[PDB]
Amino acid sequence: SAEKLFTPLKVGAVTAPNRVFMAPLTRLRSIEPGDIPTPLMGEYYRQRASAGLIISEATQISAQAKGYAGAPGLHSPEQIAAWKKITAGVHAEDGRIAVQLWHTGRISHSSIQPGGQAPVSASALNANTRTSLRDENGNAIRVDTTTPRALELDEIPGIVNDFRQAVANAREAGFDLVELHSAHGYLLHQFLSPSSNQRTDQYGGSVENRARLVLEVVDAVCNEWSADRIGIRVSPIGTFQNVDNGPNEEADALYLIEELAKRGIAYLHMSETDLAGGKPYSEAFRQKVRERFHGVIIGAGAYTAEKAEDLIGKGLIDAVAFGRDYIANPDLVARLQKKAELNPQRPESFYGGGAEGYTDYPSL
Numbered sequence: 001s002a003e004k005l006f007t008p009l010k011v012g013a014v015t016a017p018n019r020v021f022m023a024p025l026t027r028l029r030s031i032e033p034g035d036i037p038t039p040l041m042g043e044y045y046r047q048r049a050s051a052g053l054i055i056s057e058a059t060q061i062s063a064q065a066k067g068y069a070g071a072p073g074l075h076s077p078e079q080i081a082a083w084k085k086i087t088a089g090v091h092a093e094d095g096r097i098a099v100q101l102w103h104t105g106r107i108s109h110s111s112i113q114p115g116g117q118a119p120v121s122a123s124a125l126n127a128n129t130r131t132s133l134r135d136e137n138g139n140a141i142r143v144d145t146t147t148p149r150a151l152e153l154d155e156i157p158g159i160v161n162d163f164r165q166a167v168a169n170a171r172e173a174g175f176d177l178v179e180l181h182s183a184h185g186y187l188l189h190q191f192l193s194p195s196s197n198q199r200t201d202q203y204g205g206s207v208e209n210r211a212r213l214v215l216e217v218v219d220a221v222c223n224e225w226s227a228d229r230i231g232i233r234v235s236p237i238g239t240f241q242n243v244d245n246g247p248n249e250e251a252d253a254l255y256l257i258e259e260l261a262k263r264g265i266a267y268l269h270m271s272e273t274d275l276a277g278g279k280p281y282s283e284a285f286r287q288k289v290r291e292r293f294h295g296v297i298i299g300a301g302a303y304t305a306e307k308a309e310d311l312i313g314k315g316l317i318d319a320v321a322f323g324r325d326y327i328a329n330p331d332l333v334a335r336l337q338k339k340a341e342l343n344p345q346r347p348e349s350f351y352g353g354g355a356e357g358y359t360d361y362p363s364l
């Protein structure tokens with residue numbers, strides 16, 4: 001039965017028939033060389049086209065943005081052509097799909113960077129974590145992150161332009177919306193957080209300076225396409241991928257949100273907690289966010305349909321993005337609507353490999 005989860009919602013330029021969204025999910029099955037999406041990837045997304053909105057796996061805005069072997073890009077002609085087939089497949093099934101665009105920053109390794117050089121970031125501080133590469137046989141492997149080089153002030157306009165160009169490419173690729181990856185400790189978040197940003201120029205220090213980059217990017221992409229085509233994912237509260245939001249995380253978060261609201265973008269996607277522990281959002285905080293953003297708000301992070309219904313009913317959020325449940329259930333919408341049991345998850349195949357654990361999960 002449920003209630004609001006299966007009712008339409010206007011999301012920027014498109015209209016979702018339900019509020020059950022598919023969270024962006026890195027699966028690392030793209031073709032190398034070229035970081036090219038595959039027919040298998042298209043099959044996978046097509047199977048999940050009943051989602052109110054599909055948010056794609058993180059996709060590189062440039063070659064430099066690459067941090068994981070197997071992650072696709074949206075910067076080359078071959079990538080654009082391959083993505084065009086995928087979006088057409090989703091649309092053939094009457095679905096909607098947004099491409100999540102990212103620059104991994106310091107969460108990368110020199111071996112997959114242009115020229116095999118050090119990756120870039122706000123400052124020259126190692127992320128002290130690991131990323132995923134592939135071995136001689138194309139199998140996914142874990143490797144310690146390479147220490148980054150701090151972007152030169154004169155290099156920032158280039159980063160902004162790369163996001164702008166990627167969005168232009170997304171539009172031609174047939175995507176309905178674009179979601180800027182400003183969360184989980186990747187490049188944009190690296191600048192936002194004081195723990196990963198020790199810059200002394202105008203891109204470091206105060207929250208205004210730390211949010212300068214992401215806002216420049218938002219303005220650039222809104223100008224390139226249209227504000228109602230732009231979405232953004234943030235993870236402003238708590239600790240993620242070792243990157244911790246400052247000592248004034250709530251205040252800084254509300255500052256960022258008010259700035260984003262001024263651009264009138266399509267939506268605000270909030271990743272509430274990493275994959276491990278994390279303090280839950282208080283309704284008081286959800287209200288403060290709610291009154292500051294006038295577009296669609298998407299909640300995410302170990303959500304249950306019940307929690308989604310509760311929060312949507314309270315008018316605090318508009319939709320919910322499910323990640324792992326979508327990996328294992330292509331027809332999650334139908335299952336949640338019918339209160340049917342879900343397929344069990346197979347974590348060992350979340351990353352890399354082929355069809356097994358990917359297009360493997362049956363629909364009702």
Ligand SMILES: Cc1cc2nc3c(=O)[nH]c(=O)nc-3n(C[C@H](O)[C@H](O)[C@H](O)COP(=O)(O)O)c2cc1C
Nearest residue numbers: 023024025026057058300301302303322323324350
């Ligand atoms: C295999 C896997 C890959 C992920 N890749 C991405 C992604 O590309 N971009 C991102 O923003 N978050 C990513 N996430 C986080 C999910 O979007 C989501 O926020 C998280 O899984 C929590 O939601 P869930 O409990 O419904 O799965 C990933 C998580 C998993 C398990």
Ligand SMILES: Cc1c([N+](=O)[O-])cc([N+](=O)[O-])cc1[N+](=O)[O-]
Nearest residue numbers: 026057058068102132184186275
């Ligand atoms: C957000 C995210 C990833 N990403 O694309 O930025 C990649 C991940 N991974 O392990 O490949 C995991 C991510 N996550 O769950 O936060």
